[PDB]
Scaffold this active site. Sequence first.
Site, PDB file in Angstrom:
ATOM      1  N   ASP A 204       0.866  -1.216   0.000  1.00 53.89           N
ATOM      2  CA  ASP A 204       0.000   0.000   0.000  1.00 53.89           C
ATOM      3  C   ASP A 204       0.888   1.247   0.000  1.00 53.89           C
ATOM      4  O   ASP A 204       0.517   2.217  -0.660  1.00 53.89           O
ATOM      5  CB  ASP A 204      -0.936   0.000   1.214  1.00 53.89           C
ATOM      6  CG  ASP A 204      -2.293  -0.636   0.973  1.00 53.89           C
ATOM      7  OD1 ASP A 204      -2.394  -1.528   0.117  1.00 53.89           O
ATOM      8  OD2 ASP A 204      -3.253  -0.187   1.604  1.00 53.89           O
TER       9      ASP A 204
ATOM     10  N   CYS B 122      -2.155   0.405 -13.403  1.00 58.03           N
ATOM     11  CA  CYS B 122      -2.256   0.438 -11.919  1.00 58.03           C
ATOM     12  C   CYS B 122      -3.490   1.306 -11.645  1.00 58.03           C
ATOM     13  O   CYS B 122      -4.489   1.155 -12.347  1.00 58.03           O
ATOM     14  CB  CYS B 122      -0.923   0.880 -11.344  1.00 58.03           C
ATOM     15  SG  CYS B 122      -0.213   2.359 -12.114  1.00 58.03           S
ATOM     16  N   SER B 123      -3.442   2.271 -10.735  1.00 59.73           N
ATOM     17  CA  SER B 123      -4.618   3.159 -10.586  1.00 59.73           C
ATOM     18  C   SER B 123      -4.556   4.280 -11.626  1.00 59.73           C
ATOM     19  O   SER B 123      -5.560   4.489 -12.353  1.00 59.73           O
ATOM     20  CB  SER B 123      -4.816   3.672  -9.155  1.00 59.73           C
ATOM     21  OG  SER B 123      -6.168   4.082  -8.996  1.00 59.73           O
TER      22      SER B 123
ATOM     23  N   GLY C 147      -2.011   4.563 -13.963  1.00 63.39           N
ATOM     24  CA  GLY C 147      -1.276   4.137 -15.170  1.00 63.39           C
ATOM     25  C   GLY C 147       0.037   4.867 -15.394  1.00 63.39           C
ATOM     26  O   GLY C 147       0.429   4.982 -16.566  1.00 63.39           O
TER      27      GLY C 147
ATOM     28  N   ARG D  22       3.531   2.491 -10.830  1.00 61.09           N
ATOM     29  CA  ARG D  22       3.899   1.053 -10.919  1.00 61.09           C
ATOM     30  C   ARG D  22       3.961   0.613 -12.393  1.00 61.09           C
ATOM     31  O   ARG D  22       4.839  -0.189 -12.737  1.00 61.09           O
ATOM     32  CB  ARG D  22       2.870   0.233 -10.163  1.00 61.09           C
ATOM     33  CG  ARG D  22       2.873   0.499  -8.670  1.00 61.09           C
ATOM     34  CD  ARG D  22       1.714  -0.214  -8.041  1.00 61.09           C
ATOM     35  NE  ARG D  22       1.400   0.366  -6.773  1.00 61.09           N
ATOM     36  CZ  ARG D  22       0.395  -0.015  -5.970  1.00 61.09           C
ATOM     37  NH1 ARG D  22      -0.420  -1.001  -6.320  1.00 61.09           N
ATOM     38  NH2 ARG D  22       0.254   0.569  -4.777  1.00 61.09           N
ATOM     39  N   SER D  23       3.021   1.068 -13.205  1.00 61.40           N
ATOM     40  CA  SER D  23       2.921   0.749 -14.655  1.00 61.40           C
ATOM     41  C   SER D  23       4.209   1.191 -15.344  1.00 61.40           C
ATOM     42  O   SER D  23       4.728   0.463 -16.167  1.00 61.40           O
ATOM     43  CB  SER D  23       1.721   1.434 -15.279  1.00 61.40           C
ATOM     44  OG  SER D  23       0.491   0.898 -14.809  1.00 61.40           O
TER      45      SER D  23
ATOM     46  N   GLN E 274       6.540   7.805 -10.306  1.00 64.59           N
ATOM     47  CA  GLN E 274       5.821   8.861  -9.539  1.00 64.59           C
ATOM     48  C   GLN E 274       6.683   9.369  -8.374  1.00 64.59           C
ATOM     49  O   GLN E 274       6.466  10.497  -7.936  1.00 64.59           O
ATOM     50  CB  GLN E 274       4.489   8.330  -8.996  1.00 64.59           C
ATOM     51  CG  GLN E 274       3.330   8.559  -9.940  1.00 64.59           C
ATOM     52  CD  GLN E 274       2.001   8.211  -9.317  1.00 64.59           C
ATOM     53  OE1 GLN E 274       1.681   7.046  -9.102  1.00 64.59           O
ATOM     54  NE2 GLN E 274       1.198   9.230  -9.064  1.00 64.59           N
TER      55      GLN E 274
END
Length: 281
Positions: free
Chosen positions: A180, A214-215, A217, A220-221, A261
């Site tokens: 998380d 991911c959420s 994009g 993590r993407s 990010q």
Amino acid sequence: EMEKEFEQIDKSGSWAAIYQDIRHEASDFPSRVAKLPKNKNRNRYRDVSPFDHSRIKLHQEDNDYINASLIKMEEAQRSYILTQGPLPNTVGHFWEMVWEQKSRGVVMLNRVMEKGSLKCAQYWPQKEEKEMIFEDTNLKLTLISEDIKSYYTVRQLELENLTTQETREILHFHYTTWPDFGVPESPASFLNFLFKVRESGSLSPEHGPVVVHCSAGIGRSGTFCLADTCLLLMDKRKDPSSVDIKKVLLEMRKFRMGLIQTADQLRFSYLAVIEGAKFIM
């Protein structure tokens, strides 16, 4: 060589500094279509937009818009579609895109719920006998099989075009253990996951581009595409250590804003590429 660059930045604690130089050097292209008022409810986050030049267009005459970008890595001969986690109202658009782009794999790097909020709609069926019909895009989706492992789940799905009765098998690769907060401590299970996607054929030029999300994009993407492309370039080049992660990231940021990010995701991307290079040399 990046291993030595890693120790330097790490020993000097310069990750936030490197990260800010990438932020300042990054491309900025128009995203006019994303900002149209008729598209406001097709975007999960108001500050994450595809550029007009690289956006995926839906083949529906009404509204062609989806929050999705084509990332074309010419030297590596790899493409990826990066997209946001679908919204309740865009699940049908998501599968229309998968259909129209001839994608073989969907890579999901988030859980449906994280930090007690919904990061993504449940866009695939949970049981064999309960298929999903997307009335807006005339598609049916069936769960065929599900293989649950410690760190990820692979699902075989059948996507049927109700208009033409054609069917395709889609592979859903769901990385379930990204924490998380922050990044995994070790890149081992992320690399194992990335090699599983490669082994499936989902990243191969005989198919449409893989869909990665991911959420938003971008985070993590971004880490997924950056690691895959960097490891592929190390295979292809006469001198493997000619591969500059920072340059590869900036080339990918021409196609979608904000990839990677946080300075932690940047450090993790270095670690994944460095560790993955041992299994490739």
